[model samples]
Target: QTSAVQQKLAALEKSSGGRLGVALIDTADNTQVLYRGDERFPMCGTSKVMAAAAVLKQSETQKQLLNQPVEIKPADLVNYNPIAEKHVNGTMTLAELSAAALQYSDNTAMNKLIAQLGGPGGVTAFARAIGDETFRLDRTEPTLNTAIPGDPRDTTTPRAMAQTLRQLTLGHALGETQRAQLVTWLKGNTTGAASIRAGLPTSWTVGDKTGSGDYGTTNDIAVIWPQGRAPLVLVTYFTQPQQNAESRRDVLASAARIIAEGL
Candidate 1:
């Protein structure tokens, strides 16, 4: 099955005319690959996952009220789009903002939440608090722009990202209640349909996020299964100018489906 999966992936990669890098962990068996490709490539909006985790942790530690209404001002608009405009210049709970950030990949909502949590410094502090040394937030610039502070953008190893997901799943990243909330938010993530979501059978549920940048970098990190299996973490990052989003999604979907069925 593994060989067949690899062959299919090779064909997909060839067809897409792109370079693919992947790191996968079979949590049930404790098998993993620590690094793959330019593991340090800017993670684009995927960084929001860690940022969300940090916010949840801080909220738990300080007993911050998630239900408190957070007003969205003009300054809060960062990546304001049509969908974001619907919620922009309005007021919602911190929980709602977090949900917007994860589910819709709303950058404006995320920036506002990060600011309320103490900006990029606060996000970094949270990462350090969790002893995650490899993950860093590139807060000064747009999601994938090269002019950002620290690294060009959010940078992390697949192992680190997967570890974070595992922690979130096990209710270890934050208190049990907070972790549950985080999972709820993740489950609402609406992006990445072409990758992780494309692979799973309809009976399965995946809580995951997708990220892409102008540089042809694309990725997805997800927790699989509705039955609460240990959760598989798969990270696929690609760099290529001509890769079709649909084709790439097919590649990832094929690989992930094969693995899930085998399991």
Candidate 2:
């Protein structure tokens, strides 16, 4: 790695008054590293990735179609997300719900699915059975506070979540067909244009998700494809209590640049 690139990552860490959780795995090169990766950063919308997988795995055992319609009751509604505006008192398929949840970071759609699957623990346990152990879903979104008389509703270490992402991309827990479908949903995710993806070289395929918080929690996990290289998995998370949104995301952008250069 060039000193110039290393300087960027270091600068990101130094300027970020908040703690950052980062993991970079270059599968093509079989090398990896973690910065404060043991800290359990809240998953926020990122858990939608695990939730989507758990529900899809349920599809296989229950022998149901991804497009099978599921109705939303009045109580399922939440205060955020524009997608819910179109689905009120209507029905959408499991797959559609997942796409909305992943693409728009739809809180209502994913919370409804979490309830359908059982609850926060339901999704967490299912993920543990299917993949990694560190991910824990303990509360619904749109209102779960992670600090100030609060605990993170859901959380995962950078390393664990990165491995979980690799499993999904490689079709380990969800199978190839489901993985392909997941990639489709992920590619269209409307969020994270300002994070790691913003730092990457163009024309490389990046499939992933983003999670944001006002108190300086921002995250992006992706299977990024750099030109003429094998894919690399990069997971970046921040707990920036002192930094604002712009600074926190800038940290991720710099970290992503570091990963891209090493790749």
Candidate 3:
């Protein structure tokens, strides 16, 4: 049966003039609502959560890695890097860089950590380590944001990303302390005021990461707590064909509202 949520999502996607993919999981009941859940979409800044998770997973074995200083050079700077630019040619700890990337979507901080972890391969490896076969990070910032239509590089399916979030944040992928740390960083993000955050009621608490790129690509992945229920995992990815097209945060918010309604 085409459920009400499915019908509304279809109407929303059609009216928005873009491709929309969403994956929602009720952690308590293991129920899922998927719309194009297996189709690939650009990771954009949403991958920073995975990068941070890679750091946290590494911290399990490398006790001093989080506090170790990392130097950022001029070349490291990229567009939309508000936090790392201040520390250009200076140093910030791995943990600090991770927080900056998640909370502020600092591009330089993401690249620095990607370098520290041994290039984009490290994040891919981390995804595989957590048994996520669909997540991939092919390149670093600005370049990855190109998001050429149908390009497979640096992309993940909505279902795959939602599962990865569950494993890292709500599952057993990391120790309790590291899990808490990652959650805190994502929760502190200041970039999602108009995305999933806007769709949800103010009473619910949400921790999420947002991303934007070429082809009007915009994405948001969230772990939402609905007051007294177990947290739900939601991943929303949207893209349009025109290179100069503007990504719509309201589309994601609408999707969130539909998801919340079904809940």
Candidate 4:
């Protein structure tokens, strides 16, 4: 039909100067709007959200797992880790660690969680358990953000991310309390204000996780509740070849705006 929304998306991609993958799924209708949804993109900080979920999943039975203290060492520190740096050589509860990772994108906190899960494979196992086989995490922190061209390590398709997120947040994958807590953490996320959230109306409730990596990769996956409508799962992953290429949040903003308006 070449609708106005499709034409606008076509134009946006043509002028973006970077590769983009988006999957917007409406939970109520199960309808999807996809762009390069099958292509892989670096997980970057986004993997931390999954790590948080996996860790939370563990606590579903134990109950005290999240309250258990875990030690942090200077060796655990990584670039761009704000919260973990403060607790260097100290200890934090698993819940606090997960919150730091999800809300602040703290690399040290994420790495610690990944270690607790028995390396990157643990996160992948959890994703598989949730029926998202396309998700992969081959490496830990910093290295996972390499965003090597065409490399599958630590990468996920937009559709996979969107679908998996939907299950984690809205499905029966986790206990009710776990799901609600996870959503609360995501809603309090401080790293993605300039991304998809910027494109949404202030009245709509939003919870999202943002990721950044090499090769100008920037990603934000969100669950949005439009007033009086069923919730939506939106995932956007973008990257360009140049290592120093500018990553603009406005691209995501505009894409989100166009998609929201089209609906």
Off by over 4 Å in 2: 1-8, 145-153, 242-247
Best model number under lDDT: 3
TM-score of each: 0.82, 0.90, 0.98, 0.97
Give the alpha carbon lDDT tens digit for every residue of 109-166 in model 4. 8988998899999999998988988999889888899998888899999999999999
Q: Which 10 residues in a row give candidate 4 its minimum summed lDDT?
A: 1-10
Model 1 gets an lDDT of: 0.67
Q: After best superposition, candidate 4 residue 202: deviation in angstroms?
A: 1.3
Q: Give per-residue CA lDDT, model 1, range 110-206, as digits (tens).
A: 7766777687777777877777777777563255333122344567776777776777765386888888887787777887777778878767777
Which 10 residues in a row give candidate 3 its minimum summed lDDT?
72-81
Clashing pairs in 1: none
Off by over 4 Å in 3: none
lDDT of each: 0.67, 0.77, 0.91, 0.88
* Deviation (Å) of 66 in candidate 3: 1.2
Q: How do the residues 1-263 of candidate 2 rate in per-residue lDDT, one tens digit apiece?
A: 43564456656877777767788777776677777667788777888998888888877767676878888777777766668668778987888889888988888888867877898888988877976888888888765424211354577899998888887886467866777888888888888788888889878888879887656677888888788888788899876654343436777877887778746
Model 2, TM vs. native: 0.90
Q: Higher lDDT: candidate 3 or 4?
A: 3
Comparing 1 and 4 on TM-score, the stronger one: 4
For every candidate structure, what is the RMSD over all alpha carbons to the true structure, in angstroms? 3.7, 2.7, 0.9, 1.2
Consecutive 10-residue window with the lowest summed lDDT within model 2: 143-152
Residue runs of model 4 more than 4 Å from their true location after superposition: 1-3
